[PDB]
């Protein structure tokens, strides 16, 4: 059986700027157990039918996990753009797999704000599919060299989220797991 418990019931999730990737292999995968689970608010599949997942079998399966705002959930899809889609986590336009997300306000939000989750605001260019840029260098936005502490046309490219229990839904944290399927290593029952 595949270690889905270690992905969906994980103690902690990574920031979207530095999303975790776990490669799943040599196991039996139960998909309908998730599809029909009341624990999820969003379950959207691309290239595959969610009702046939138990019969389908694949090669490598990658589970990419991270935390974003509810309002940013719409960006986790092929053909979409935005700060997350372009500078944090880019999906290929021919992406094959399913995007699963749920409200984690009662799990991650803290009084005063949980600032352990970051995303990029700035980068020299847009990300390639599944590119994970975790550098901490200062971004320069002009002809002026930085050579030190951020300031004019020099920025620390990351920003934290003020995730709080008093936030509106769009500003509440959501746990997102993207299941990317290549196409016999991972196979359903």
């Amino acid at each position: 059986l595949c270690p889905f418990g270690e992905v969906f019931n994980a103690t902690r999730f990574a920031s979207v700027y530095a999303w975790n990737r776990k490669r799943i292999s040599n196991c039996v995968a139960d998909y309908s157990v998730l599809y029909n689970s009341a624990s999820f608010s969003t379950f959207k599949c691309y290239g595959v039918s969610p009702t046939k997942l138990n019969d389908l079998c694949f090669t490598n399966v990658y589970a990419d996990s991270f935390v974003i705002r509810g309002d940013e959930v719409r960006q986790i899809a092929p053909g979409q753009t935005g700060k997350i889609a372009d500078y944090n986590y880019k999906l290929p336009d021919d992406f094959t797999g399913c995007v699963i997300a749920w409200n984690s306000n009662n799990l991650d939000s803290k009084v005063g704000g949980n600032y352990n989750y970051l995303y990029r605001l700035f980068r020299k260019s847009n990300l390639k599919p599944f590119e994970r840029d975790i550098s901490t260098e200062i971004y320069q936005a002009g002809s002026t060299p930085c050579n030190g502490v951020e300031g004019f046309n020099c920025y620390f490219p990351l920003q934290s989220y003020g995730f709080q229990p008093t936030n509106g839904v769009g500003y509440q944290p959501y746990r997102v797991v993207v299941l990317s399927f290549e196409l016999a290593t991972v196979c359903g029952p």
Partner: antibody
Amino acid sequence: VQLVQSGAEKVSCKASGGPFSSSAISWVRQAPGQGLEWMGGIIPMVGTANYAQRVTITADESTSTAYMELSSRSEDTAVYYCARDSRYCSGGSCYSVWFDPWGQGTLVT
Amino acid sequence: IQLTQSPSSLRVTITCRASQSISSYLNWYQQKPGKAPKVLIYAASSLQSGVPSRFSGSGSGTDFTLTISSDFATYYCQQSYSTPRTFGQGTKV
């Protein structure tokens, strides 16, 4: 979001609430009768401190605490403050940086 | 980039001039005796939440002004435009 500094005499600054590794923590010196001087600061996520153009500036995310080590003159007698580097930022172009919180201050003689 | 502010001692206004253009990267602080400084104005003219409407300011490039419509403390201007970061001399109300 408060900053707590060590008492009068290493000089520590513990963060309680708010962001830590995502925001540079700087040290500012204020000798009696004088103005403010920025001496440097560090982003815990980077691990590298930058210095004003003698003093060791470091931080450790695991305890949400910043440190400054002073060693070997009488002319350096001053109150030392820690402060967090915050910014008001808009889309496209980010145009400001300032020091928002600020600890009680450490008296070093 | 050094800052020069005046008058050194004092509705009142305090001005701070940059030796070089610094866009809108200056700020203003209020420091009471024996206490840490607090933020008044950032990004040249934007008020910090909690700051009374009695406080305002504006300017661009080199010439900036802090205005108090009606708090006896020392006020400072700050330069975060470029390294090294610096501060003004301080004006006493």
